[PDB]
Amino acid sequence: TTALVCDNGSGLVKAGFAGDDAPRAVFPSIVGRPRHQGVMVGMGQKDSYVGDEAQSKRGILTLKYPIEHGIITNWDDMEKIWHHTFYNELRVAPEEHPTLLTEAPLNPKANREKMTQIMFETFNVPAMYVAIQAVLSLYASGRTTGIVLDSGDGVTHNVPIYEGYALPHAIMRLDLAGRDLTDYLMKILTERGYSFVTTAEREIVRDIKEKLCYVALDFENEMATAASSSSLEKSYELPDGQVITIGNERFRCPETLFQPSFIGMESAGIHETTYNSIMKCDIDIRKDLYANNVMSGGTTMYPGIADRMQKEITALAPSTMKIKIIAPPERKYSVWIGGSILASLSTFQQMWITKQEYDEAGPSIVHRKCF
Amino acid sequence: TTALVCDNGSGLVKAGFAGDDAPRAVFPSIVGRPRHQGVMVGMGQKDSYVGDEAQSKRGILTLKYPIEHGIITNWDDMEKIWHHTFYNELRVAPEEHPTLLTEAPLNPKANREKMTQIMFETFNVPAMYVAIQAVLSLYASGRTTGIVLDSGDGVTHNVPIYEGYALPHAIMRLDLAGRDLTDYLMKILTERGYSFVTTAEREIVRDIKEKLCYVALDFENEMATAASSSSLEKSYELPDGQVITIGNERFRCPETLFQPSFIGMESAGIHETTYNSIMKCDIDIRKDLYANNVMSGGTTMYPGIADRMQKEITALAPSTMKIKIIAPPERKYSVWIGGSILASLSTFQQMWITKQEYDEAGPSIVHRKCF
Amino acid sequence: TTALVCDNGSGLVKAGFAGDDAPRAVFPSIVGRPRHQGVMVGMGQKDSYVGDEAQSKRGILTLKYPIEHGIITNWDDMEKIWHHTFYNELRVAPEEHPTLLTEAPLNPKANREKMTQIMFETFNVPAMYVAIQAVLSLYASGRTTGIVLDSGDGVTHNVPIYEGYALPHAIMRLDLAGRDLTDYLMKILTERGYSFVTTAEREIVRDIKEKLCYVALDFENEMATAASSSSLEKSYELPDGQVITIGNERFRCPETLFQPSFIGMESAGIHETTYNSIMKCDIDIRKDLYANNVMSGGTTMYPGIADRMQKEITALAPSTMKIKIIAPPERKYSVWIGGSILASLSTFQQMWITKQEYDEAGPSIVHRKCF
Amino acid sequence: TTALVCDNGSGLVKAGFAGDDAPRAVFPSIVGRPRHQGVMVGMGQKDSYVGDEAQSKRGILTLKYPIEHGIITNWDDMEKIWHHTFYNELRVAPEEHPTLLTEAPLNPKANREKMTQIMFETFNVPAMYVAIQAVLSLYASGRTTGIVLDSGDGVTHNVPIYEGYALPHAIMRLDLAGRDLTDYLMKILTERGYSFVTTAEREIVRDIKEKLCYVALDFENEMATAASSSSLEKSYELPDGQVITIGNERFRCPETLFQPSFIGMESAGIHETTYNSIMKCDIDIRKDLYANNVMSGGTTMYPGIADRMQKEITALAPSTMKIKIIAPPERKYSVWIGGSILASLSTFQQMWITKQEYDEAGPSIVHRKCF
Amino acid sequence: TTALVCDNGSGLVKAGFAGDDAPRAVFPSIVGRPRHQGVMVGMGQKDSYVGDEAQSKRGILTLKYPIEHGIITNWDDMEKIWHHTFYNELRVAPEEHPTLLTEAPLNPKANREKMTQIMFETFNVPAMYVAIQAVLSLYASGRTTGIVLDSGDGVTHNVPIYEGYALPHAIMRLDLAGRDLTDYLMKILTERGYSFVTTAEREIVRDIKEKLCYVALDFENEMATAASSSSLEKSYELPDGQVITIGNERFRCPETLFQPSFIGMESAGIHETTYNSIMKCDIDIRKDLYANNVMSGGTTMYPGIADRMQKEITALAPSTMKIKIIAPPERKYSVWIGGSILASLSTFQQMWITKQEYDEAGPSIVHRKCF
Ligand SMILES: Nc1ncnc2c1ncn2[C@@H]1O[C@H](COP(=O)(O)OP(=O)(O)O)[C@@H](O)[C@H]1O
Ligand SMILES: Nc1ncnc2c1ncn2[C@@H]1O[C@H](COP(=O)(O)OP(=O)(O)O)[C@@H](O)[C@H]1O
Ligand SMILES: Nc1ncnc2c1ncn2[C@@H]1O[C@H](COP(=O)(O)OP(=O)(O)O)[C@@H](O)[C@H]1O
Ligand SMILES: Nc1ncnc2c1ncn2[C@@H]1O[C@H](COP(=O)(O)OP(=O)(O)O)[C@@H](O)[C@H]1O
Ligand SMILES: Nc1ncnc2c1ncn2[C@@H]1O[C@H](COP(=O)(O)OP(=O)(O)O)[C@@H](O)[C@H]1O
Ligand SMILES: [Mg+2]
Ligand SMILES: [Mg+2]
Ligand SMILES: [Mg+2]
Ligand SMILES: [Mg+2]
Ligand SMILES: [Mg+2]
């Protein structure tokens, strides 16, 4: 009777039963296939490797991500990832359990049909739903009013919610995300002669960004000091014993989120879209949203991001308005934790799209029960 | 139903049925022909002598090796050696039994056709295969990951294998081998006035190198000590009672493998090619290869070679990486023992090149089933 | 008052005054040192040989290239090459003349300081600049809009230029070049038993590739025909009278640029990076770049490369878009000819980095006047 | 002696001498500035581009419109546009000629002073006037009684005129216009996965709306049919050969003008404000206005708009009253053509605001000679 | 200040001051001692006879050569020969003059110490050197590149020199020489019944070989003709009037150098070692050595040897390579003439091994200053 809260994270798939408080599995969404012929006969080899397998065989595999900007580009890759998720990681047969998926808002409608038909006719789920990720993030705080800024592996979006009403004219989609910051980090490391090229090495640079990067409060003073304050510089080890030394490159990376023109992006910075979504609201409610500005998603984990956000938005919003950036701990899981709560809420049983209803309407039925 | 594991060693032919644990015959690959006319009539003489015959008649024969650098230079000599191997040493008719041969990698393709056509139309074998020697060496340890350094009578090569995948872009062929060390030992012995010239005497110098030579750990301190430490010097007897005295010449011979410029060779030493083959690998797997660095071939039998290898490669590879030179005993037979195992492995029955398949494709078929 | 257009080619150094139309000197960038002791006393020997000297003494020298992938690895070798270039080949004192250098984009910044400090304090140049090679190539056609594909001895890169604006977010660096094709040609020649090993012999294989190789338009039909059409095969002489015969090896070499997986490279082929650099551009300008697709660098000299390029990119770009591969003659010098023009253009006198400006800023000044 | 009929269109500036019958120049009101540094030296570049220049360089420019909702937001941008208009497009010196401007009614009075002072002291015009756009539209029909519905790029308004008297208590200003319809078209195209983001791409979507959109007479039956009648769907080409397919999106765009709640606008539809302006009139004259309901402005060019207007207003106005929507051809220029006539009418010479009169009154004088 | 160019010829000692152009003394290296008791009292007899004395008393002496294969076997005999050379033939005291000796390469090192200690402590020379004979031969032609084939009384060797660098990995030592040809001539003369046995008679057969032997160009046709062409046969007188008649024995002697299997030698003929030394060289330089193939030593004086050499090596070396056997006149002295030049060359004064340096290092010092 418990729901399977699944997910379609662009980076990490997340899964675990409702009523639990932490996800049971987290693993990268990678499909990999061998690049060279097997020559030691009888390995018990496989045609393809997924999850942890592909982070270990990482020297001999072509790696693909089947998700780009939240749009699934290859359904035969994407179908294998789920076929692994149910049968091997959770080890639970899906035809007993209602399955709750998620996606970003403002997606090409054809994706919502494909996921529905795969669930109803490969896996034969009893029922399905398709929630909108930012809405689930808000239940983690137990609030009912706030602007959500959510920034995953592959997209950033804003959704203002007031009194449990969404304002669908105000949503912003901003295609700037951790995958872009990683691809930019490869170019500034090349200034020091370290060279990375392959998909096997992208997965090594990403381990730097999770450990040594932090956000400066006054980037101009910081970068002027970094010319002399050698105490900034830090050292890290590759898999082989090759040492790496890192300097002002520690913070020129996450500075991209506040000045996307560094990666040549035309779209405004994350605070300028956070502000400009409030300006779409009726001139009453603005006072309430400045008190409930909630952040989620892993690309807000960098130490000091909340302190920067407050100082930036204080320059835009008028004075006498107080601003309260609510950036709680564990915000790397809120989108999943909120999923666990909602799937347990007694009233939601009205919304399960039945198998019988799809056979009469055809796939388009899921356009009737969303924004 | 058992396979004949044959071989094409440059020095010693090795043969014996699969499922046995030691080769039944080992003898030098020499064809010899008389240099002078028979004058005591009625000896029951022969036109040519092969194997043990030629190591005994060694005063009256012209000796030839039909193998140079793993490339067979004379097919009519080479065909006699096998004609001896089956009918007289194993005393088994070959037209019952699948025959497994070996060769070094990176060979002129014409050799692989000649061996195939001789097997199919002189001996009329039922089936054939052509394995790559270094790959077979790895089964002797029962490993599935490692760098193999194999150095026979006539060639040295490296092959890194990861997860049962070979990396054909990384293979090194190095034409420095025991035959060169023997031809160099003849020149430094001449410093003491002992004189050897003929092919009958090359086979006597080789008996020195197998008995009195050893590898110094600190060649500069060793050679500086050898000027005074008379306890280094050793004595040995020729076939006649002529005594020989040997001194710093005990170790200046195997020092050649680490400094080929002594024989004027331009190519780097065996550890520098062992290292530089790892540097062709993707920056993930290096950590695994430093733990599985396996040696085989008779020119690694010298006492103390493994201890030298470790100290040399520790200077090249970064610290904090542990290095484990796995130089097991009996490594003079691993290439054959691994052959016995592989020919018994149940899955290999898919690979036997049938007689029927050669008559349709022609000799080129064997280019389709190798690197 | 005329500029010295120097260069840092990975293969051939090129030099000659501005306002001339062809370079006065071209010679390989090799430093060589003797491998054996001089024994005929009184030769008038030298410690080291550079340029033409080392292509003649080619049997007794260790040869090094001081340039790898456009990154200078040894400054004491590299300083000798220039010390030869000014004083012996041009026979002109450099302290009169402004000196214009070049380098590939996306290089470790430390190299740009070293070259600057050597010019200001060994040679005492009056002024210096550091242009970006692909930008100079475009002046040879007198165009102001186009995508440049430039592929020298040691690196390949793409730079789209529109209306005289570079788009620094779109540049591709691809480390696949003639030096890799030569090292691959040594392995497929070994199939026929010809053996080359030493740096003296690499400089002989390279003479084959410049003379007998050509690009097939339909590699699958060509290779299927080459099994029977003996009229493909060609013969060539080594320095000694040893004849060589070459067959399908004529074209399997330059096929590498379109399928780098043959040398096991993961990066896409030169047309796939040429295409994928256009896809970084704003959806307006693509129509203009398909009309101005200019090639330069010696590794585009092979007969028939332009005809292959057009047929390949026509499969990627949509129809109704016309494609015009502009592959003019003399494209082996465009990067130098464009240098001669730019150094004569009246407005460039604003950009000469003065000696006085370096003494105040220190070496970092050259980071202020580039991409 | 002829007047310069200039204009302040929100989208297209329009200019041409009085007594001509068609405007001599029409070009977008855009100022653009380069986004990246010039790197091909000596282009003859400019700091800023205006008019046709900016529709061609459209891949490298930041574009701004200096007009929003008829309120000029930046006077230094706006002053350049006119500086281009006189000296380069008309190529006529303005200090000879009386200049007639226009603006929407109900504007912040400060704008009317700024335009006046710029004309008197930068350009030194001999005289000026400031007509109200909807009043000029009526002379194109040669009528003297009618309700005008005028809907330009940036504002919509209604003005009833009876017997040449305006009724200033009845004017409606409605801030819904083509710029809003374009920004809404970007969101429904994203349903099909086509993505546009930048100001360079807004100017491409606008080319769709001028070509494929039309107004349905019975939107509910049309949209119900569009689920099956594939003959609705149409195809169009981007600048690159990318084909686009469009379906019910052809007509859901201009449906916004009749149901602004689709874009979440609270204000009533254009017919409901057209009706509710008549209800402000004295209960005599209504019969006359239903016979002279004249439309102008480009956002009434869509095929079939007049037929929809008649059926809508027939539901509001009582029966037995006949309704006659007068939607003539060329209504894209009436506001300019009527300007040409009025500036030639002999009696208007009483109204030219003299230079002498401004120096005595100060800028406020223009509040004395309007509504 | 002039050097004493001495020598250690196996057959003829050669001596004469530097700066002279011909040796002042040449005499056989023989020590002889009486075989019978003196019985005519008061002859003024001597215990031993050396040089010309022993060629005259040749009927009553035991003769010994103290040199065998270039290795001195008896130092008390060898010390007398020099004691004669200085005090009686040159009549010059050696303690004034630097003394230059020679030896063959590849000799037992103990010989180089013995000669050094005898020179420093019996004769008390001021300085010494030990040159390598084949290197001195090359100065006679004034060349700096060539392969030297040198074949004295007691050894044959090859040394390729390129650009004044020797290639110590390529040297061949071949122990086939005039002393062997003389001992073979004694056996074929015995076919005609002439009998020689004693050391007194060996010195008579040697006078035949210097006068009647010549090399056939086509030995098979020559020997077939010699069965009938009596005009071949020649006659010669012994010391007594005994006439000797010689026929095909004129040329079957020097034919041994091209087919050593006639004397049962296993080693290849002098042209096969001359060729096979070139094949040790890097594949560049071979073209240069075929143009500078210089011969020296008395066993190349036979009429027609050069014409045979060219026809033989033309069969081995590929065509299109030209071959130029440089066999100049006076080649019986080149090894001495080149000694006279080198000892006069101004730079050689750096190499004289001082007396002071030997007393510190001990005898081993001379291993430091040679190959
Ligand atoms: N400790 C960390 N510090 C900073 N960033 C992190 C850290 N751990 C993970 N990340 C970033 O989190 C991203 C994944 O965000 P996530 O919210 O999981 O996206 P999704 O849920 O859509 O997979 C990774 O791409 C990585 O860049
Ligand atoms: N006891 C020993 N110590 C050192 N070297 C040995 C010993 N026995 C044999 N060898 C060397 O082993 C070489 C043969 O190596 P091997 O692996 O048999 O080559 P292959 O297998 O190709 O014939 C011989 O040439 C000899 O130099
Ligand atoms: N005739 C030719 N045909 C094909 N390739 C050539 C020819 N001549 C030279 N090359 C190639 O040109 C390369 C040098 O390219 P180049 O543009 O000179 O590089 P760089 O300018 O950086 O030295 C050489 O490595 C060689 O492989
Ligand atoms: N052929 C067409 N069909 C429909 N709309 C059009 C067409 N041509 C132009 N438009 C619209 O006309 C608008 C401009 O209206 P216009 O009356 O020129 O405003 P202004 O005069 O204030 O610039 C443009 O924004 C565009 O949306
Ligand atoms: N006229 C000649 N023709 C052929 N051979 C000669 C002649 N004169 C001398 N010889 C040979 O020259 C040999 C001596 O060679 P030589 O170069 O003097 O040796 P070395 O210099 O070491 O004494 C003698 O043994 C003799 O056989
Ligand atoms: Mg996420
Ligand atoms: Mg072996
Ligand atoms: Mg170049
Ligand atoms: Mg208008
Ligand atoms: Mg001699």
Residue numbers in the entry:
A (entry chain B), B (entry chain D), C (entry chain C), D (entry chain A), E (entry chain E): 5 to 375
According to the publication:
Tc toxins deliver toxic enzymes into host cells by a unique injection mechanism. One of these enzymes is the actin ADP-ribosyltransferase TccC3, whose activity leads to the clustering of the cellular cytoskeleton and ultimately cell death. Here, we show that TccC3 HVR modifies only actin filaments (F-actin) and not monomeric actin (G-actin) as previously proposed. We present the structures of the TccC3 HVR enzyme in the apo-state, in complex with F-actin, as well as the structure of ADP-ribosylated F-actin, thereby providing three structural snapshots of TcHVR activity.
To decipher the structural basis of this mechanism, we performed a single-particle cryo-EM analysis of ADP-ribosylated F-actin. We obtained a 3D reconstruction of the ADP-ribosylated actin filament at an average resolution of 3.5 Å, which allowed us to build an atomic model for F-actin including the ADP-ribose. The density corresponding to the ADP-ribose appears only at a lower threshold and is not as well defined as the rest of the map, indicating that the ADP-ribose moiety is flexible and that probably not all actin subunits are modified. Therefore, it is unlikely that the ADP-ribose modification itself is sufficient to stabilize actin-actin interactions to an extent that would lead to a toxic effect. However, when we compared our model of ADP-ribosylated F-actin with available structures of F-actin in complex with actin-binding proteins, we found that the ADP-ribose moiety occupies the same position on F-actin as the major actin-depolymerizing factor cofilin. Steric hindrance of the cofilin-F-actin interaction by the ADP-ribose could provide an alternative explanation for the increase in bulk amount of actin filaments in toxin-injected cells. Strikingly, we observed no binding of cofilin and no severing of ADP-ribosylated actin filaments under conditions where wild-type filaments were rapidly bound and severed. This confirmed that the modification impairs the formation of the cofilin-F-actin complex. In conclusion, ADP-ribosylated F-actin is impaired in interacting with actin-severing and destabilizing proteins, resulting in an inhibition of actin turnover and the accumulation of excess actin filaments. Thus, unlike R177-modifying enzymes, ADP-ribosylation of T148 stabilizes actin filaments indirectly by hindering cofilin-mediated depolymerization.
